[PDB]
């Protein structure tokens, strides 16, 4: 069934699973036309498919050409997501295919189930967690590759950098969601926090800065301060 606070450690067991987030697949800017009407212009998007145990991110870039001549794009985006996830699974060796796919939005369940009818043994699950994966486009290197793409493209990342050398997957996922929650609540402040100190760099082959253990605690503390604050600034408390 659904994924929630009670079965949270299931994410770090040895059964291959993937989170699929479709929130950045169909992206648009809304603008006025010369006649004073409103129109959308699509911009490139991405499917966020993540193995929470390993950190492996399968970033399928959704080029705006895929919407050309199509209607009901918000509905199509969910099916396009499911088609691309299904194609990903089929591309993987059998022993790498997931045993579960967890979608962050329930509207993805039927599209994915139908596209995965060939895989009756892969459980398609919703979740009750309010996961912040929509903020993946606040990670500069991810946004960069999506916006630069001129064609459909899959790019592989480890969203944990090298953290698993030093911490467990549970801790790595908690750090990831804290960072993403911060970036979602106040992107400027969150990015200020991550980069204020110019002596801490992001390795060419990483996404986040090369913080030491002690620096990560300071960082994590500042991200929680930000999140609690913005929650005050928002609710006046």
């Amino acid at each position: 069934g659904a994924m929630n606070s009670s079965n949270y450690a299931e994410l770090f067991n040895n059964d291959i699973k993937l989170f699929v987030d479709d929130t950045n697949v169909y992206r648009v800017t809304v603008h006025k036309t010369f006649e004073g009407n409103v129109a959308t212009k699509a911009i490139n998007g991405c499917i966020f498919t993540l193995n929470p145990k390993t950190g492996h991110l399968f970033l399928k870039i959704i080029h705006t050409s895929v919407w050309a001549g199509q209607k009901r794009l918000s509905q199509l985006a969910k099916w396009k997501t499911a088609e691309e996830v299904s194609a990903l699974v089929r591309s993987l060796p059998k022993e790498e295919q997931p045993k579960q796919i967890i979608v962050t939005r329930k509207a993805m369940l039927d599209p994915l189930e139908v596209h995965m009818l060939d895989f009756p043994n892969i459980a398609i699950r919703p979740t009750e967690l309010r996961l912040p994966f929509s903020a993946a486009m606040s990670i500069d290197k991810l946004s960069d590759v999506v916006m630069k793409a001129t064609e459909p493209q899959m790019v592989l990342f480890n969203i944990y950098d090298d953290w698993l050398d030093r911490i467990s997957s549970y801790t790595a996922f908690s750090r990831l969601t804290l960072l993403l929650r911060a970036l979602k609540t106040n992107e400027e402040s969150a990015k200020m926090i991550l980069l204020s100190d110019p002596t801490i760099t992001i390795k060419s082959y990483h996404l986040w800065p090369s913080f030491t253990d002690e620096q990560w605690i300071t960082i994590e503390s500042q991200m929680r301060d930000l999140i609690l604050t913005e929650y005050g600034r928002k609710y006046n408390v």
Binding site: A82, E113, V114, L117
Partner: protein, 300 residues
Amino acid sequence: MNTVPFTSAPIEVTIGIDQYSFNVKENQPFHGIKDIPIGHVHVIHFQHADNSSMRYGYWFDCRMGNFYIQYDPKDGLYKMMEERDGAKFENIVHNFKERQMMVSYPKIDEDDTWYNLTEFVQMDKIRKIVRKDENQFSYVDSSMTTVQENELSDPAHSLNYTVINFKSREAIRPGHEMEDFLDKSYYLNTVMLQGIFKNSSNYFGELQFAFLNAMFFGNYGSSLQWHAMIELICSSATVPKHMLDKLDEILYYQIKTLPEQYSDILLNERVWNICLYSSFQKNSLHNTEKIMENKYPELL
């Protein structure tokens, strides 16, 4: 006009015949039902006074043999049987008709209700859904489960309705996933109509039989099948015009006949609101939508 005689009535029972019903008291001198119209299937059904659990009954067609009912005190129910000896049946019926110990099938001359509920129902198809090939008549009760219910446990006592599953490889062509899930016309027209049912009369007949089993026996899997077959049509963008017209008539008479007090369990809110207000055919069931809005505006 045909007759289903009763050997006797040893237990108090409500007897149904098609949409009619009457009470028989324990050991009352009741010897059956006369004047049954020829040309239609019929259902004779039972609810014991002691045990309102298990409504049960028999689908039959009087053209297929001389059938009668006798109570079995070991199995505890009224059983339909066939009399092979024609002369003996004629004599037993005539004697009971002379002693006036039979109720008359009470059809009003204007009334096409039963025809309209059973227009496409054929005994040969009933006997394939209800498999018991040594009898010409078919037993159904409240508790029988469908083949599809068993896939999700006695195969001999099942309702072998056509399996319909919208999230199945049968329903969804590779590479048309979105197309075929949002518009079921492929599944309706090619897979079911052309492939399995052969024609829309056999489709409508199974739909009508499922409704009747749901209504007369409160058979839950029948109710699922009835709604599934409706939804498959309503969710198809491309349906023959004659099929929509006939479906609207079919549903209208089912909705008209349903007991007002059973709507809460026998009508699926989601399917009906989808079919009448969201689906491709939302504007194609005028008679059905009008009776539903005037009789069960609560469901909608």
